[PDB]
Structures are given as C-alpha cells and as structure tokens.
Coordinates of C-alpha atoms (C1' of nucleotides) in Angstrom, one line a residue:
Chain A
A27 CA -14.7 33.7 -43.0
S28 CA -11.7 35.7 -42.0
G29 CA -9.7 32.6 -41.3
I30 CA -8.4 34.1 -38.0
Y31 CA -9.3 32.2 -34.8
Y32 CA -8.2 33.1 -31.3
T33 CA -6.4 30.1 -29.7
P34 CA -6.7 30.3 -25.9
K35 CA -3.5 31.7 -24.2
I36 CA -3.1 28.6 -22.0
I37 CA -3.1 26.3 -25.0
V38 CA -0.5 28.4 -26.8
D39 CA 1.7 28.5 -23.7
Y40 CA 1.5 24.7 -23.3
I41 CA 2.4 24.1 -26.9
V42 CA 5.3 26.5 -26.9
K43 CA 6.6 25.0 -23.6
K44 CA 6.2 21.5 -25.0
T45 CA 8.3 22.4 -28.0
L46 CA 11.0 24.5 -26.3
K47 CA 11.3 23.5 -22.7
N48 CA 14.3 21.1 -23.1
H49 CA 16.2 22.9 -25.9
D50 CA 19.9 23.2 -25.4
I51 CA 20.6 26.8 -26.5
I52 CA 24.3 26.4 -25.8
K53 CA 24.7 23.6 -28.3
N54 CA 22.4 25.1 -30.9
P55 CA 21.9 28.9 -30.5
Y56 CA 20.1 29.1 -33.9
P57 CA 16.8 27.2 -33.6
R58 CA 14.2 27.6 -36.4
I59 CA 10.6 27.8 -35.0
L60 CA 7.9 28.0 -37.7
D61 CA 4.2 28.8 -37.4
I62 CA 2.7 27.7 -40.7
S63 CA -0.7 29.3 -40.0
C64 CA 0.4 32.1 -37.6
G65 CA -2.3 34.6 -38.5
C66 CA -2.0 37.3 -35.8
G67 CA 0.9 35.4 -34.3
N68 CA -0.4 34.2 -30.9
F69 CA 2.2 31.4 -30.9
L70 CA 5.1 33.5 -32.4
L71 CA 5.0 36.1 -29.7
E72 CA 5.2 33.5 -26.9
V73 CA 8.0 31.8 -28.9
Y74 CA 9.8 35.2 -29.0
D75 CA 9.4 35.7 -25.2
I76 CA 10.6 32.1 -24.4
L77 CA 13.6 32.6 -26.8
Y78 CA 14.4 36.0 -25.2
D79 CA 14.4 34.5 -21.7
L80 CA 16.6 31.6 -22.9
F81 CA 19.2 33.9 -24.6
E82 CA 19.3 36.3 -21.7
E83 CA 19.8 33.5 -19.1
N84 CA 22.7 32.1 -21.0
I85 CA 24.2 35.2 -22.6
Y86 CA 27.7 34.9 -21.0
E87 CA 28.0 31.2 -21.8
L88 CA 27.3 32.1 -25.4
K89 CA 29.9 34.9 -25.1
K90 CA 32.5 32.4 -24.0
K91 CA 31.7 29.7 -26.5
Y92 CA 31.1 31.9 -29.5
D93 CA 31.9 35.4 -30.7
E94 CA 31.8 37.6 -27.6
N95 CA 31.0 40.8 -29.5
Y96 CA 28.0 39.2 -31.3
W97 CA 26.3 37.7 -28.3
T98 CA 25.1 40.7 -26.3
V99 CA 21.8 41.4 -24.6
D100 CA 21.2 44.3 -27.0
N101 CA 21.6 42.0 -30.0
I102 CA 19.2 39.2 -28.7
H103 CA 16.2 40.8 -30.4
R104 CA 17.9 41.1 -33.8
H105 CA 19.2 37.5 -33.6
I106 CA 15.8 36.2 -32.7
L107 CA 14.1 38.1 -35.6
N108 CA 16.8 37.1 -38.1
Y109 CA 17.5 33.4 -37.4
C110 CA 14.7 32.0 -35.2
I111 CA 11.1 33.1 -35.9
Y112 CA 9.4 32.1 -39.1
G113 CA 5.7 32.6 -39.9
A114 CA 3.4 32.0 -42.8
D115 CA -0.2 33.1 -43.4
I116 CA -2.6 33.9 -46.2
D117 CA -3.9 37.2 -44.8
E118 CA -1.9 40.3 -45.5
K119 CA -3.5 42.3 -42.7
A120 CA -2.6 39.7 -40.0
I121 CA 1.0 39.4 -41.3
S122 CA 1.3 43.2 -41.1
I123 CA 0.0 43.3 -37.6
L124 CA 2.4 40.4 -36.6
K125 CA 5.3 42.2 -38.1
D126 CA 4.4 45.4 -36.3
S127 CA 4.2 43.5 -33.0
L128 CA 7.5 41.8 -33.5
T129 CA 9.1 45.2 -34.3
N130 CA 7.6 46.7 -31.2
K131 CA 9.0 44.0 -29.0
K132 CA 12.2 46.1 -28.8
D138 CA 17.5 54.3 -36.9
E139 CA 19.2 50.9 -37.3
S140 CA 19.5 48.6 -40.3
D141 CA 15.8 47.9 -40.4
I142 CA 16.0 44.3 -39.1
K143 CA 14.2 41.9 -41.5
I144 CA 11.5 39.5 -40.3
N145 CA 10.8 36.1 -41.9
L146 CA 7.1 36.5 -42.3
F147 CA 5.5 35.2 -45.5
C148 CA 2.0 36.0 -46.9
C149 CA 1.3 33.0 -49.1
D150 CA -0.3 29.6 -49.2
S151 CA 1.8 27.3 -46.9
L152 CA 0.7 24.2 -49.0
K153 CA 2.0 25.9 -52.2
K154 CA 5.1 27.6 -50.9
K155 CA 8.5 26.0 -51.7
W156 CA 10.3 25.7 -48.4
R157 CA 14.0 26.2 -48.8
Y158 CA 15.0 24.7 -45.4
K159 CA 13.5 22.4 -42.7
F160 CA 12.7 23.7 -39.2
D161 CA 13.7 22.6 -35.7
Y162 CA 10.3 23.3 -34.2
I163 CA 6.8 23.8 -35.7
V164 CA 3.8 25.2 -33.8
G165 CA 0.5 26.7 -34.6
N166 CA -3.2 26.1 -35.4
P167 CA -3.9 25.0 -39.0
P168 CA -7.1 26.0 -40.8
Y169 CA -10.0 23.6 -40.6
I170 CA -12.1 23.5 -43.8
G171 CA -14.3 20.6 -44.8
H172 CA -15.2 19.2 -48.2
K173 CA -18.3 21.5 -48.5
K174 CA -16.6 24.8 -47.8
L175 CA -13.4 24.0 -49.9
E176 CA -13.3 25.3 -53.5
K177 CA -13.3 22.7 -56.3
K178 CA -10.1 23.7 -58.0
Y179 CA -8.2 23.8 -54.7
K180 CA -9.6 20.4 -53.9
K181 CA -8.3 19.2 -57.2
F182 CA -4.9 20.6 -56.3
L183 CA -4.9 18.9 -52.9
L184 CA -5.9 15.6 -54.6
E185 CA -3.1 15.9 -57.0
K186 CA -0.4 17.0 -54.6
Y187 CA -1.6 15.6 -51.2
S188 CA -3.0 12.2 -52.3
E189 CA -1.1 10.5 -49.5
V190 CA -3.3 12.1 -46.8
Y191 CA -6.2 14.0 -48.7
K192 CA -8.9 11.8 -50.3
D193 CA -12.7 11.9 -50.6
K194 CA -14.2 13.7 -47.6
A195 CA -10.8 14.6 -46.0
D196 CA -10.0 18.0 -44.4
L197 CA -7.4 20.7 -45.2
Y198 CA -5.6 20.2 -41.8
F199 CA -4.8 16.7 -43.0
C200 CA -2.6 18.3 -45.7
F201 CA -1.3 20.8 -43.1
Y202 CA -0.3 17.8 -41.0
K203 CA 1.5 16.3 -44.0
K204 CA 3.3 19.6 -44.7
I205 CA 4.4 20.0 -41.1
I206 CA 5.8 16.5 -41.0
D207 CA 7.6 16.9 -44.4
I208 CA 9.4 20.1 -43.5
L209 CA 10.3 19.1 -39.9
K210 CA 14.0 18.8 -39.3
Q211 CA 15.4 15.4 -38.2
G212 CA 15.2 15.2 -34.5
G213 CA 12.8 18.2 -34.4
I214 CA 9.6 18.5 -32.4
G215 CA 6.2 19.6 -33.7
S216 CA 3.1 20.5 -31.6
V217 CA -0.2 21.6 -33.0
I218 CA -3.9 21.8 -32.1
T219 CA -6.4 20.4 -34.6
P220 CA -9.8 18.8 -34.6
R221 CA -10.0 15.5 -32.8
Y222 CA -12.0 13.8 -35.5
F223 CA -9.1 12.5 -37.6
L224 CA -8.2 10.1 -34.7
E225 CA -11.3 8.1 -35.5
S226 CA -12.8 9.3 -38.7
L227 CA -12.9 7.1 -41.8
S228 CA -11.4 9.9 -43.9
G229 CA -8.4 10.1 -41.5
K230 CA -7.1 6.6 -42.1
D231 CA -4.4 7.7 -44.5
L232 CA -3.4 10.6 -42.3
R233 CA -3.1 8.3 -39.3
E234 CA -1.0 5.9 -41.3
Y235 CA 1.3 8.7 -42.5
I236 CA 1.7 10.1 -39.0
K237 CA 2.4 6.6 -37.6
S238 CA 5.0 5.8 -40.3
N239 CA 6.8 9.2 -40.5
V240 CA 7.0 10.5 -36.9
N241 CA 7.0 9.4 -33.3
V242 CA 3.9 10.7 -31.6
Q243 CA 5.0 12.0 -28.2
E244 CA 1.6 13.0 -26.8
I245 CA -2.1 13.2 -27.6
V246 CA -4.3 15.5 -25.5
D247 CA -7.9 14.7 -26.3
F248 CA -10.5 17.3 -25.1
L249 CA -13.5 15.2 -26.4
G250 CA -16.6 17.4 -26.6
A251 CA -15.2 20.3 -24.5
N252 CA -15.6 23.7 -26.1
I253 CA -12.0 24.9 -26.3
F254 CA -12.8 27.7 -28.8
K255 CA -15.6 30.0 -27.6
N256 CA -18.6 30.2 -29.9
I257 CA -17.1 27.6 -32.2
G258 CA -18.7 24.3 -32.9
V259 CA -15.6 22.1 -33.1
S260 CA -13.9 19.5 -30.9
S261 CA -10.1 19.9 -30.4
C262 CA -7.1 17.9 -29.6
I263 CA -3.4 18.6 -29.2
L264 CA -0.8 16.5 -31.0
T265 CA 2.9 16.5 -30.1
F266 CA 5.3 14.5 -32.2
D267 CA 9.1 14.3 -32.9
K268 CA 11.5 12.9 -35.5
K269 CA 14.2 11.8 -33.0
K270 CA 15.9 8.4 -33.2
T271 CA 14.1 6.4 -30.5
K272 CA 13.3 2.7 -29.9
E273 CA 10.4 2.9 -27.4
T274 CA 7.6 4.5 -29.5
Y275 CA 5.2 5.0 -26.7
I276 CA 2.5 7.7 -26.7
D277 CA 1.2 9.5 -23.6
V278 CA -2.6 10.0 -24.0
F279 CA -4.4 12.5 -21.8
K280 CA -8.1 12.1 -22.2
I281 CA -10.6 14.4 -20.5
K282 CA -13.1 12.9 -18.2
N283 CA -15.5 15.8 -17.7
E284 CA -16.5 17.7 -20.8
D285 CA -18.0 20.6 -18.9
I286 CA -14.7 21.7 -17.3
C287 CA -13.4 25.3 -17.6
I288 CA -10.0 25.5 -19.3
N289 CA -9.0 28.3 -16.9
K290 CA -9.1 26.2 -13.8
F291 CA -5.3 26.5 -13.3
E292 CA -2.6 28.9 -14.6
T293 CA -1.1 26.1 -16.7
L294 CA -2.5 23.3 -18.9
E295 CA -0.2 20.7 -17.4
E296 CA -1.7 21.3 -14.0
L297 CA -5.1 20.5 -15.5
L298 CA -3.6 17.4 -17.1
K299 CA -2.1 16.2 -13.8
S300 CA -5.4 16.8 -12.0
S301 CA -8.4 14.5 -11.6
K302 CA -10.1 16.2 -14.6
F303 CA -7.9 14.1 -17.0
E304 CA -6.9 10.5 -17.2
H305 CA -3.4 9.5 -18.5
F306 CA -2.4 6.2 -20.1
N307 CA 0.2 4.9 -22.5
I308 CA -0.3 3.5 -26.0
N309 CA 2.2 1.4 -27.9
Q310 CA 2.7 3.1 -31.3
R311 CA 4.0 0.0 -32.9
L312 CA 0.8 -1.9 -32.0
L313 CA -1.4 0.7 -33.7
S314 CA -3.8 -0.7 -36.4
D315 CA -5.7 1.2 -39.1
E316 CA -7.8 2.5 -36.2
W317 CA -6.2 4.1 -33.1
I318 CA -7.8 2.5 -30.0
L319 CA -6.8 5.1 -27.4
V320 CA -8.3 3.6 -24.3
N321 CA -7.0 2.5 -20.9
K322 CA -6.2 -1.1 -19.9
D323 CA -9.7 -1.9 -18.5
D324 CA -11.4 -0.5 -21.6
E325 CA -8.9 -2.3 -23.8
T326 CA -9.6 -5.6 -22.0
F327 CA -13.4 -5.0 -22.3
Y328 CA -13.2 -4.3 -26.0
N329 CA -10.9 -7.2 -26.7
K330 CA -13.2 -9.6 -24.8
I331 CA -16.3 -8.5 -26.7
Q332 CA -14.5 -8.6 -30.1
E333 CA -13.1 -12.1 -29.4
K334 CA -16.3 -13.6 -28.0
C335 CA -18.5 -12.4 -30.8
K336 CA -18.5 -14.5 -34.1
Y337 CA -20.7 -12.3 -36.3
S338 CA -21.0 -8.6 -37.2
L339 CA -23.9 -6.4 -38.3
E340 CA -22.4 -6.0 -41.7
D341 CA -22.3 -9.8 -42.1
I342 CA -25.9 -10.4 -41.3
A343 CA -27.6 -7.1 -42.3
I344 CA -28.0 -4.7 -45.3
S345 CA -27.6 -1.1 -44.3
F346 CA -28.6 2.1 -46.1
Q347 CA -28.9 5.9 -45.6
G348 CA -32.1 7.9 -45.6
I349 CA -33.5 9.8 -48.5
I350 CA -31.7 13.0 -49.6
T351 CA -34.3 15.1 -51.3
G352 CA -32.0 18.1 -51.8
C353 CA -34.6 20.6 -50.6
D354 CA -36.6 19.4 -47.6
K355 CA -39.0 22.3 -47.5
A356 CA -40.2 21.4 -51.1
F357 CA -41.1 17.8 -50.3
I358 CA -41.7 17.5 -46.6
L359 CA -45.1 18.8 -45.3
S360 CA -46.9 18.6 -42.0
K361 CA -49.4 15.7 -41.9
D362 CA -52.1 18.3 -41.0
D363 CA -51.3 20.5 -43.9
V364 CA -54.2 21.5 -46.2
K365 CA -51.9 21.3 -49.3
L366 CA -51.6 17.6 -48.7
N367 CA -55.2 17.4 -50.0
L368 CA -53.8 18.1 -53.4
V369 CA -51.5 15.0 -53.2
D370 CA -52.8 11.5 -53.7
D371 CA -52.0 9.2 -50.8
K372 CA -49.9 6.9 -53.0
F373 CA -47.3 9.7 -53.3
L374 CA -47.2 10.3 -49.5
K375 CA -44.8 8.5 -47.2
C376 CA -44.4 8.7 -43.4
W377 CA -41.4 10.9 -42.5
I378 CA -39.5 10.9 -39.2
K379 CA -36.5 12.8 -37.8
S380 CA -33.6 11.8 -35.6
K381 CA -35.4 12.9 -32.5
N382 CA -38.3 10.6 -33.3
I383 CA -36.0 7.5 -32.8
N384 CA -36.2 6.1 -29.2
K385 CA -35.1 2.8 -27.7
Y386 CA -37.0 -0.2 -29.3
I387 CA -39.7 2.1 -30.8
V388 CA -40.2 5.1 -33.1
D389 CA -42.4 8.1 -32.3
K390 CA -45.6 8.6 -34.4
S391 CA -44.9 10.3 -37.7
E392 CA -45.7 14.0 -37.8
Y393 CA -44.5 14.7 -41.4
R394 CA -45.3 13.4 -44.9
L395 CA -42.8 13.1 -47.8
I396 CA -44.0 13.6 -51.3
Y397 CA -42.2 10.8 -53.3
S398 CA -42.2 12.9 -56.4
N399 CA -40.2 10.3 -58.4
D400 CA -43.6 8.5 -58.9
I401 CA -44.9 11.5 -60.8
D402 CA -44.7 10.5 -64.4
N403 CA -44.8 13.9 -66.1
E404 CA -45.5 17.6 -65.4
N405 CA -48.8 17.8 -67.3
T406 CA -51.0 15.2 -65.4
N407 CA -50.1 16.4 -61.9
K408 CA -49.7 20.1 -62.6
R409 CA -51.5 21.2 -59.4
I410 CA -48.8 19.6 -57.1
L411 CA -45.9 20.9 -59.1
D412 CA -47.3 24.5 -59.4
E413 CA -48.6 24.9 -55.8
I414 CA -46.3 22.8 -53.7
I415 CA -43.0 21.8 -55.2
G416 CA -42.5 24.6 -57.7
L417 CA -42.4 27.1 -54.8
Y418 CA -38.8 26.1 -54.5
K419 CA -38.2 25.3 -58.2
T420 CA -35.3 27.7 -58.6
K421 CA -33.5 26.1 -55.6
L422 CA -34.4 22.7 -56.9
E423 CA -32.8 23.7 -60.2
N424 CA -29.5 24.5 -58.5
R425 CA -28.9 20.8 -57.5
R426 CA -26.0 19.1 -59.2
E427 CA -28.1 16.3 -60.8
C428 CA -30.7 18.8 -62.1
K429 CA -28.1 21.0 -63.8
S430 CA -26.6 18.0 -65.6
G431 CA -30.1 16.8 -66.7
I432 CA -29.9 13.5 -64.8
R433 CA -32.7 14.5 -62.4
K434 CA -35.8 16.4 -63.2
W435 CA -36.4 19.6 -61.3
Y436 CA -39.3 18.2 -59.3
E437 CA -37.7 14.8 -58.5
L438 CA -35.9 13.8 -55.4
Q439 CA -32.1 14.2 -55.6
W440 CA -31.5 10.7 -54.1
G441 CA -34.8 8.8 -53.8
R442 CA -33.0 5.5 -52.9
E443 CA -35.4 2.5 -53.2
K444 CA -38.9 2.5 -51.8
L445 CA -38.8 -1.3 -51.1
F446 CA -35.9 -0.8 -48.6
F447 CA -37.9 1.6 -46.5
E448 CA -41.3 -0.1 -46.9
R449 CA -40.4 -3.1 -44.8
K450 CA -39.7 -4.1 -41.2
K451 CA -36.2 -2.8 -40.3
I452 CA -34.1 -1.2 -37.6
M453 CA -33.5 2.6 -37.6
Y454 CA -31.0 4.7 -35.5
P455 CA -30.1 8.4 -35.5
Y456 CA -26.9 9.5 -37.1
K457 CA -25.9 11.6 -34.1
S458 CA -26.9 10.7 -30.5
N459 CA -25.6 10.6 -26.9
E460 CA -26.4 6.9 -26.6
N461 CA -27.4 3.8 -28.5
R462 CA -30.9 4.2 -29.9
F463 CA -31.9 1.3 -32.2
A464 CA -35.6 1.0 -32.9
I465 CA -37.7 -1.5 -34.8
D466 CA -39.8 0.3 -37.4
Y467 CA -43.3 -1.2 -37.9
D468 CA -44.8 1.7 -39.9
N469 CA -42.6 1.7 -43.0
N470 CA -41.2 5.1 -42.0
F471 CA -39.0 7.1 -44.4
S472 CA -36.3 9.4 -43.2
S473 CA -33.6 11.8 -44.3
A474 CA -29.9 11.0 -43.8
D475 CA -30.1 11.9 -40.1
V476 CA -31.5 8.4 -39.6
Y477 CA -29.8 5.3 -40.9
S478 CA -31.6 2.0 -41.4
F479 CA -30.8 -1.7 -41.9
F480 CA -32.6 -5.0 -42.3
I481 CA -31.5 -8.5 -41.6
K482 CA -30.6 -10.8 -44.5
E483 CA -32.9 -13.7 -45.3
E484 CA -30.2 -16.3 -44.6
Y485 CA -29.7 -14.9 -41.0
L486 CA -33.4 -14.4 -40.1
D487 CA -33.5 -17.9 -38.5
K488 CA -30.3 -16.9 -36.6
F489 CA -31.0 -13.3 -35.5
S490 CA -34.3 -11.5 -34.9
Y491 CA -34.9 -7.8 -34.8
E492 CA -36.1 -7.9 -31.2
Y493 CA -32.9 -9.7 -30.0
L494 CA -30.8 -7.2 -32.0
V495 CA -32.4 -4.1 -30.5
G496 CA -32.3 -5.7 -27.1
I497 CA -28.5 -6.3 -27.2
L498 CA -27.7 -3.1 -29.1
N499 CA -29.6 -0.8 -26.7
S500 CA -27.9 -2.3 -23.6
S501 CA -25.4 -0.3 -21.6
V502 CA -22.8 -3.0 -22.4
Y503 CA -23.1 -2.4 -26.1
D504 CA -23.4 1.4 -25.6
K505 CA -20.0 1.4 -23.8
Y506 CA -18.6 -1.1 -26.4
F507 CA -19.6 1.1 -29.4
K508 CA -18.4 4.3 -27.7
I509 CA -14.9 2.8 -27.3
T510 CA -14.2 3.3 -31.0
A511 CA -17.0 5.8 -31.9
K512 CA -16.3 9.2 -33.4
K513 CA -16.9 11.9 -30.8
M514 CA -18.4 14.9 -32.5
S515 CA -19.4 17.4 -29.8
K516 CA -20.5 17.5 -26.2
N517 CA -22.7 14.4 -25.6
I518 CA -22.8 13.7 -29.3
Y519 CA -21.4 10.6 -31.0
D520 CA -21.5 9.8 -34.7
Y521 CA -23.7 6.7 -35.4
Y522 CA -22.8 6.0 -39.0
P523 CA -22.7 2.7 -40.9
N524 CA -18.9 2.8 -41.3
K525 CA -18.7 2.1 -37.5
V526 CA -22.2 0.8 -36.6
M527 CA -22.0 -2.0 -39.2
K528 CA -18.7 -3.1 -37.6
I529 CA -20.4 -3.8 -34.3
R530 CA -19.9 -7.5 -33.5
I531 CA -22.7 -9.7 -32.1
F532 CA -23.0 -13.0 -30.4
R533 CA -25.5 -15.9 -30.0
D534 CA -25.6 -18.3 -27.1
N535 CA -27.9 -19.8 -24.5
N536 CA -29.2 -16.4 -23.4
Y537 CA -30.7 -15.6 -26.8
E538 CA -34.2 -16.7 -25.8
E539 CA -34.4 -14.8 -22.5
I540 CA -32.9 -11.7 -24.0
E541 CA -35.4 -11.8 -26.9
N542 CA -38.2 -12.3 -24.4
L543 CA -37.1 -9.3 -22.3
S544 CA -36.8 -7.2 -25.4
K545 CA -40.4 -8.2 -26.4
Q546 CA -41.7 -7.3 -23.0
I547 CA -40.0 -3.9 -23.2
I548 CA -41.5 -3.3 -26.6
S549 CA -44.9 -4.4 -25.5
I550 CA -44.8 -2.0 -22.5
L551 CA -43.5 0.9 -24.6
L552 CA -46.2 0.4 -27.2
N553 CA -49.0 0.5 -24.6
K554 CA -51.1 3.6 -24.3
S555 CA -50.2 4.0 -20.6
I556 CA -46.5 3.3 -20.0
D557 CA -44.9 2.3 -16.7
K558 CA -41.3 3.1 -17.6
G559 CA -39.8 1.9 -14.2
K560 CA -40.6 -1.7 -15.2
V561 CA -38.9 -1.1 -18.5
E562 CA -35.8 0.1 -16.6
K563 CA -35.9 -3.0 -14.4
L564 CA -36.1 -5.3 -17.4
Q565 CA -33.2 -3.4 -19.0
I566 CA -31.1 -3.9 -15.9
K567 CA -31.9 -7.6 -16.0
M568 CA -31.0 -7.8 -19.6
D569 CA -27.7 -5.9 -19.0
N570 CA -26.9 -8.5 -16.3
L571 CA -27.7 -11.3 -18.7
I572 CA -25.6 -9.8 -21.5
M573 CA -22.6 -9.3 -19.1
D574 CA -23.0 -13.0 -18.1
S575 CA -23.0 -13.9 -21.8
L576 CA -19.9 -11.9 -22.6
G577 CA -18.0 -12.9 -19.4
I578 CA -17.5 -9.4 -18.1
Chain B
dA1 C1' -25.1 40.0 -24.3
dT2 C1' -23.0 34.9 -24.1
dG3 C1' -23.3 30.2 -22.7
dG4 C1' -25.3 25.9 -23.2
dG5 C1' -28.8 22.6 -24.6
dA6 C1' -31.9 20.5 -28.4
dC7 C1' -31.4 19.2 -32.8
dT8 C1' -29.6 18.1 -37.4
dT9 C1' -29.2 19.6 -44.6
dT10 C1' -27.5 18.7 -48.8
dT11 C1' -23.3 19.2 -50.9
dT12 C1' -19.9 16.2 -52.4
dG13 C1' -16.4 12.6 -54.0
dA14 C1' -16.4 8.2 -55.5
Chain C
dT1 C1' -26.2 5.2 -62.1
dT2 C1' -26.3 6.0 -57.3
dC3 C1' -24.0 4.9 -53.0
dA4 C1' -22.6 7.3 -48.2
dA5 C1' -19.4 10.9 -45.3
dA6 C1' -19.0 15.3 -43.6
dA7 C1' -19.4 19.4 -37.5
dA8 C1' -13.7 26.1 -37.1
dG9 C1' -21.9 22.5 -37.0
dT10 C1' -26.7 25.8 -36.6
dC11 C1' -30.5 27.7 -34.1
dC12 C1' -32.8 29.1 -29.9
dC13 C1' -33.3 31.1 -25.4
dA14 C1' -32.2 32.4 -20.6

DNA sequence: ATGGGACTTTTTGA
DNA sequence: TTCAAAAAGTCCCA
C-alpha cells in the first residue's frame, strides 16, 4: 500500500557493484546514476559511498588532469550531490528522508540534490543517464487504476498490453533514457521471462539492449513476507558483437540469501548453476536452460508430430463471481431447497490427482437454468440473495448483461458434462486426470477434451499416461512459468503447446495407464505397484523419445 | 512473533 | 457475447 519495499542489502550492493565496478572515473568524472523508484534510497546511499571511495582514491589524478582547485577531498560530497546522484519517487515522505540522509552524509551554499517527487513514467527527462539502478514497483492488472491503465496503453503500447504489469513500462522507460554505452541493473519479478504478457517486453529488451546477465532466483523468497519471485537483470547499450548472456539459475529454492557476505560468492558456489545463452538465437520465448536440458527439449520437440492444441479443445472452469453464493457443501440442509437438476459436482485444484479425481465434496448451483425470480423464490431469497449486494457489484450485473442471481461466466454445460481431462492451474508437478463424473470446477482447474477426428489416434488413458510421466514433467517444466516455491503455472497458453508422439509403444503405455487407473480406483490401493508401473512407463517413454 | 507449507478468487482486457 | 490471464499471492499454524 505504501509502495516502499526493503530490498536486501546484499542485492543492493551486488547491483551497485555490477553497475559501477569498471567505471573509469579519470576519463569521465561526471557519471549520472539514476534510481527511478528510489523510495527511501537504499540504492542511492550505496552509490554515494561507492562514488566517494572512487573520487577519494583518484583525487590527485583528477587534480593533475583537471582544475586542481575544484578537485579536493572536501569538494567530493558537493560534486557527487550536484552531478552524479539522481532519484525519482512518488512518495514525498520517502524523498524527504532520502534528501535528509544525503545531506547528513557530510552554513554553505545549501547544495542542491536532484531528487524528484513525481511519476517517473510521466516525467519528461531532459537528459539520459550513464547508469540506472533500483527496484521498480510491481502492480498487476487488478490493483492498477483504470485511467492509469488507459494512459499506459496509450503511451506504453510497445510493452504494456492486456494483462501486463507496471514494471514492463518501467523497463521500457529505463531502456529509453539509458545513455549510449551505459549500464542498467534492476531487480524485478521473474515472471516476464516466461509469461505470455511479457512477450512484447522480451522483444523490446532483446532488440534495444544487450542483456549482460540474468540472475534467476526461481521460487526463493528474496523479500521477507512478500509473495513474489524475483530476478536480477543487467543490460548495457555498448557496441558489442558477441551478444551472449550469463544466466545464473538457483538450484535450491530453500537457500538463505545471507550465506556469504557478497552475492557473487553465492553465485560462484554450488547453490547456483551458470550457463551462456546466445541473445541472437532468442525466440519469442526465452529458453534459459543448460546444454543438457536444451538437447532434451529439442529432441522432444523434434520427435513429436502433434500437440495438445492440435488434437484437443481446452477451456477454463466456471467463474461464478461469488463462490460463497453458489457453492455449497454436499451435506448442506439448504441444498434440500434446490432441485437436483440445478446441482453440479464441484471440485477444487487439490482434488486433482494423477489419473483420477477425488470424490466431490461440493455442489454448484447452476443458477443460469433458473428462468425467473418468481418461480424459484425460495432459492434466491434463502441461498443466493444472502450475497445479492456483492453479486450486484459484478461488472456484467451493473451493465445489465447478467442477472444478479446468474453466474458471471457459466461457460457451456455440455463441455463439463462429458469425459475429459482436468489439471490444476497451479501445481508442483504434472497432474492430469480423467474425469468420469462430469465434475465442474472454477478457474483453478483447466479442462480439455479430445477432438472427434483424433479419438481414433489418441485416447484419454494414453494421454494421461504420457503427461503424468517424469519425462513430460521435466519437459513441461523447461518452459513453464515458475510462480513461487514448488509452484508452476499450468495454464492453456503453455499446456496446450505440449507436443505429443505416437509410435509402437502406444499400446503398452495405454495398458500401463489403464492398470494404474484400475488400481487407483479400487477401494483398497497398493500404491507401490502403481509406482512400479509408473517407472516402467517412464522407461518406455524414454525409449520412445530416444533419451 | 515470523517462517514456511497447503492452497487458490474474480477482476479484467480483449 | 464471452473467452482466458493474472501472484510485491492469501491464509493458517508452529
């Protein structure tokens, strides 16, 4: 709410060092370092200390090369505050605190400080900057105001579109006002590396700057008590012909960031893996994996001839708009007031397992089948109407498109009331299950059914067998969107792009999947046999894919 | 009190 | 008319 977030000191030190470790202060004693979202100035104070050390270490060389009277130890503070440090923020209080801190670093002429309290995306910047650091704000499409979103769409259409984020626009602004040959280094969410909304931002970054380094923390909790996954991006505008990116990807997401005094020590250690990515070979997606994973992914992609999107029709669950008004326990007495034709089985993401779905515990009132208010007054007055006001605040109800008691997005009943495959929208592993009970679900579970023309080619049992294998788990996680610790996004924009194969092992894989399903559906389950069959199927799939 | 695991709504642009 | 993406997630407990 306040917009002020405490970046860890080690991250700030690493970013400042990355920007300013190889700066020739003799050649250019007037470097412009800008923090576009400084806030309390965690980055700017470190920049001040680094610059003070740099000027003090080379004070006599500057005295020789330039005006000897101007370059004195006493005058370093004034020079840094006048020509070096620039900060911008939207909070007056934080800017005041930062100005006080910069003043207290060292009456006189009341040295001026280049601190601005305004919107960095609206400010007209007179000059470009040698170096840019800081941590931009992260605000999604839900928490962003409508008029500001219109402004972003009009002015930042190159990177902001649909469900994009504000830090996309901040990336664009940082790139735009970066001096030629300058270096920028920021910490942002890692989602733009793989999200669908980030495609335009990725294209802009690829085509406008050379990405020096990507540090991916995956699901590690960099910010305490904050539910976000972070990455560090360092880029330049220098004239270079190599265009190779160092990628440091974390291997253990439970590590403590204070293991060493410096972040580079952590990167060098066994807690991180390093590899190189050719920027010129980047596609719409950024496949930031090592050589072994790249070979694995390429083999799977080249071997497979079909994809899930080609052979299946996919859809999202029902979005009622107020779950408490339409979802009831199956053992609720109020369900006695609702006819069984209006009741549908309701499942959550946790109910989805491998090859099977847990028994339904909830019922959904498909209120779209209620013709009018008069005939079914009991249900509306005693069940749904308890949240009527909230139901009236939905967008479609305010515009009159939807009645107050109707589901906001009821989809089509025929899609759910058939044999299909369901999977949770967020999970730690591949969980694709055949639904035999015509289960309905919210958007936390996605569903798909095979097209008629591909039924003779692919069966549900074979699909769930291959998709739940460790091979396909690893294959999907190569390009999957990492959300948090042990959580990947399983959405149609990437699930439907999974490629599938068909060869001489189809029959045995289908038989093993059928055996696993039969064991799982039995009243008494011996799961060890299921694990053994899964191992056999994994071996068979690896044999099929030549890996 | 914080840290970490189980679990996941509906607002929103298109 | 109506699809689907979006964690500065959210809540609970030791």
